[PDB]
């Protein structure tokens, strides 16, 4: 209220001006009379991009390479989403690197365009924020220039690369050239020296010699003094390979357009066959390439678009699946990987591992880079440029921000309190936080665990690796509030307070005494100012990140019989607006109806998977109260 607050009191002056307009709702706030209105948020603002220090590339819609965007990375909290289950067993030592260039492989395009689902990848990546990108070239925490392969998402601006997967960029390669080496040559050594067991002088058949893995395979094979036969699409690829490798003559080249390479190679090997086959082509080219194998020949099939019968063979253990093995060795980082780490490091020193030709795409043309890789119209490595390499060779990376879409994440080292988190939306929202980073939950109920659905959910969080604690108390007195934060601070610093508690006594206003009007007012007027008083004091104030107080559209639309709930839901929203006035974090979802956890007031109940999609936007926004409701259909006349 301005310096001249109104004086509404019976026979006043301001009141009479208000008894003349006879407006139902009069609100004097910010110095002027007005009203509270719900202003629609355009669908374009839900994907509005804002500067963010840490970002990573994901897809808005699975299977669409045109939906690739940059979202907020959970590395702002220091850790990486997906630390549940099998990712909790391997305690790999990781070095945090500032990515400068990110190489785009065909593994990312296959996942991005829906050719393969995320579930085919190693099980350690199931809960990761993204699955795009493995190789990179940036700077470790000490400022050194390093390049390496890491579990996804490596199409990001910061990574946590295991120290057993990081190579040092020689002081002759720019970081741009380093971004092309790690995966192409690590795969080439795996296919040739680790799975094919190539020996000196052996004959190797390499499909798609113009691919980055194909170019790496030729370079590795030539170092082993091998007889190379390679499949080139057109004459441009043949010319490129010949110039790149002067040892390659035209006799060493065939066409990927027909299976006429079988007679040529069989005749040129005098019926001996090829010792190692690095197979990417499929169908009659896969059959014609096994048919070229020698008696002891090895067939390394690394194509991604396997048939249905081939996949069943993988499931039945009939054949090994070698197309996501470099991704699996990067999760374990064991004896088999350290063999590839040493083979590539030796190749770099001996000059075998040379950088490949590459095309550099900015961070905003991520979609176009993916399309360029998919089409395969021209040879080369597609390398996304995240940062600009400094002229020095050991220097700290400047702090910068990138435009990225919101993605709410929770600190895994902080404790999150969920008052009423042992219910329908309490337990399904808790599961959402567990996926987004939370690993320390204190769930509070008046009775604790009383059903087998609550006991099964909490036994699921605990199995995933979440430190859950269920308190059978009501936060309605300072003693109860103290206990909930004694248990929270014991688990870790408080980084979030959620109040999903609801109590409803629906009745006609005139058939309700005080004991029955104050029923819904405990979970909404007494647990919101005992959680707000405790969040405004040390040490909660500094550590706290989220203060979410769930509300209802009864404060914006009204309902019949819920006059006590409306009073409680409105005073809750006024405490959250006071928090914004003081600069404290606050979020107040104002939901209409939720389906999974019919038509009321002509509004369809939302599916929960969509409530959590708008909730994520609600948390990553500047407004206090956001009203989410679904309409049966846009209103017409009468």
């Amino acid at each position: 209220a301005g310096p001249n607050p109104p004086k509404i009191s019976a026979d006043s002056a301001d009141f009479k001006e208000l008894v003349r307009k006879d407006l139902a709702y009069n609100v004097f706030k910010n110095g002027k009379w007005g009203t509270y209105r719900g202003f629609v948020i355009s669908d374009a603002d839900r994907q509005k991009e804002r500067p963010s220090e840490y970002v990573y590339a994901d897809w808005l819609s699975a299977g669409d390479m045109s939906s690739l965007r940059w979202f907020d990375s959970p590395l702002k909290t220091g850790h990486n989403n997906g630390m549940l289950g099998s990712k909790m067993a391997h305690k790999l030592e990781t070095e945090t690197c500032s990515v400068y260039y990110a190489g785009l492989n065909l593994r990312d395009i296959i996942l991005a365009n829906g050719t393969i689902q995320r579930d085919i990848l190693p099980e350690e990546t199931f809960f990761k924020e993204g699955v795009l990108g493995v190789e990179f070239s940036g700077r470790n925490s000490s400022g050194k220039r390093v390049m390496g392969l890491c579990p996804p998402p490596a199409l990001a601006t910061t990574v946590k690369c295991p120290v057993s997967s990081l190579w040092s960029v020689p002081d002759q390669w720019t970081l741009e050239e380093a971004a092309t080496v790690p995966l192409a040559y690590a795969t080439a050594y795996y296919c040739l020296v680790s799975e094919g067991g190539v020996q000196k002088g052996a004959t190797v058949f390499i499909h798609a010699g113009a691919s980055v893995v194909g170019q790496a395979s030729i370079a590795v094979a030539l170092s082993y003094n091998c007889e190379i036969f390679t499949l080139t699409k057109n004459s441009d690829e043949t010319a490129l390979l010949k110039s790149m490798y002067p040892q390659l003559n035209d006799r060493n080249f065939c066409s990927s357009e027909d299976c006429s390479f079988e007679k040529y190679i069989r005749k040129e090997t005098k019926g001996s066959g090829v010792d190692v086959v690095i197979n990417t082509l499929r169908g009659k080219f896969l059959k014609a390439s096994r048919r070229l194998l020698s008696k002891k020949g090895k067939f390394v099939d690394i194509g991604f678009k396997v048939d249905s019968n081939t996949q069943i063979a993988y499931y039945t253990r009939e054949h090994p699946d070698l197309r996501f093995q470099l991704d699996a060795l990067l999760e374990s980082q064991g004896p088999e990987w350290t063999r590839l780490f040493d083979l590539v490091q030796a190749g770099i020193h001996s000059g075998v591992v040379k950088p490949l030709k590459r095309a550099v795409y900015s961070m905003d043309k991520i979609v176009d880079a993916f399309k360029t890789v998919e089409a395969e119209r021209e040879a080369g490595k597609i390398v996304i440029k995240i940062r600009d390499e400094e002229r020095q060779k050991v220097c700290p990376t400047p702090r910068t921000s990138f435009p990225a879409i919101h993605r709410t994440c929770f600190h895994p080292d902080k404790s999150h309190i969920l008052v009423g988190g042992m219910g329908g939306m309490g337990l399904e929202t808790a599961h959402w936080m567990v996926l987004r980073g939370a690993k320390k939950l204190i769930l509070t109920s008046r009775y604790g665990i009383t059903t087998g659905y609550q006991a099964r959910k909490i036994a699921f969080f605990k199995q995933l690796g979440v430190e859950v604690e269920v308190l059978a108390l009501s936060v309605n007195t300072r003693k109860a509030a103290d206990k909930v934060f004694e248990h929270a601070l014991k688990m870790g610093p408080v980084g979030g307070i959620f109040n999903m508690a609801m109590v409803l006594y629906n009745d006609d206003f005139l058939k309700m005494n005080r004991e029955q009007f104050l029923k819904p007012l405990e979970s909404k007027i007494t647990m919101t100012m005992l959680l707000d008083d405790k969040s405004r004091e040390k040490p909660v104030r500094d550590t706290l990140d989220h203060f979410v107080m769930f509300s209802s559209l009864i404060v914006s639309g009204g309902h019949l019989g819920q006059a006590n709930y409306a009073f409680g839901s409105t005073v809750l929203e006024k405490i959250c607006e006071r928090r914004k006035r003081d600069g404290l974090p606050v979020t107040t979802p104002q939901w209409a109806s939720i389906a999974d956890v019919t038509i009321i007031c002509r509004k369809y109940p939302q599916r929960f998977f969509n409530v959590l999609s708008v909730f994520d936007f609600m948390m990553s926004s500047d407004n206090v109260v956001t009203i989410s409701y679904v309409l049966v259909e846009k209103s017409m006349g009468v």
Binding site: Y36, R37, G38, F39, V40, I41, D43, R46, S61, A62, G63, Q117, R118, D119, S308, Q311, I312, Y315, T316, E428, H431, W432, L435, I449, T450, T451, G452, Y453, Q454, A455, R456, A459, F460, V555, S556, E573, Q590, A595, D596, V597, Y604, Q606, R607, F608, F609, N610, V614, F617, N623, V624, V625, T626, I627, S628, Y629, V630, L631, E633
Partner: protein, 262 residues
């Protein structure tokens, strides 16, 4: 070429319970519904009654989803190769299911669940059990909307290893509720669409007979989930190593209207 099956989704047709199986609003034919069609077709070729034949389906590939339509007639063609058992459930010129169906007279079932009589979930507290309301609240949160016909799991343990599966004489429902045990064994948030059933053994000979006509209370058959072998076994049915593919969850309604209460 072989048996052509007509599914009558009419007001009072006996196969109207099949509209009580939806995924994110869309009505779908159950993935273990073409198994029964292949099962009934093979028995018809042999001339025997389908409930006296013990079959085994291996590597059943689900290529599409047969979208049911209320008050409509769906015609599907099942083709079974006489000697090798290669079967094909194909609607029009589009494949919906493929695999190999093999009959036998010996014991095909691996697990001994068909011999289990009672329910081991007796005397347990109400906080150590999952009831049909709690079981199908978890499926609904993942997009699997099952009506009263397809709500076969009447009780289960917190691990979902032990369950009480209802037997009502409808085999498409029963096979789906035995696949729900596999689904109930993989807690999560995403929607998984089955894409490959490595083995499905149906042995009606060890299965209880159809309930008397006009039955109101049906019997519950004990079911078990084996994590070691990945077998969902209840009665004379066994589903082994079912593989699923993540499905993008479609919105039943139109996008929500977000506003800023200011």
């Amino acid at each position: 070429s072989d048996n052509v099956i007509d599914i009558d989704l009419s007001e009072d047709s006996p196969e109207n319970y099949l509209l009580e199986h939806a995924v994110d609003g869309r009505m779908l034919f159950p993935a273990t519904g073409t198994l029964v069609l292949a099962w009934k077709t093979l028995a018809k070729l042999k001339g025997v009654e389908f409930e006296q034949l013990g079959v085994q389906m291996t590597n059943v590939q689900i290529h599409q989803a047969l979208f049911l339509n209320p008050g409509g007639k769906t015609t599907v063609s099942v083709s079974v190769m006489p000697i090798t058992g290669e079967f094909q459930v194909r609607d029009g010129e589009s494949l919906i299911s493929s695999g190999v169906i093999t009959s036998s007279e010996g014991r095909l079932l691996e697990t001994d669940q068909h011999m289990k009589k009672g329910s081991v979930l007796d005397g347990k507290p109400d906080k150590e059990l999952l009831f049909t309301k709690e079981i199908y609240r978890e499926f609904l949160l993942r997009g699997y909307e099952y009506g009263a016909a397809f709500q076969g799991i009447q009780r289960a343990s917190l691990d979902a290893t032990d369950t009480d599966i209802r037997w009502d004489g409808r085999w498409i429902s029963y096979l789906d509720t035995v696949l729900q045990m596999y689904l109930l064994s993989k807690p999560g948030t995403h929607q998984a669409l089955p894409t490959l059933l490595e083995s499905v053994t149906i042995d009606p000979r060890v299965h209880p007979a159809q309930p008397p006509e006009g039955t109101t209370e049906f019997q519950v058959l004990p079911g078990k989930w084996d994590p070691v072998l990945q077998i969902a076994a209840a009665g004379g049915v066994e589903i082994r190593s079912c593989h699923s593919i993540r499905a993008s969850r479609r919105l039943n309604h139109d996008p929500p209207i977000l506003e800023d209460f200011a």
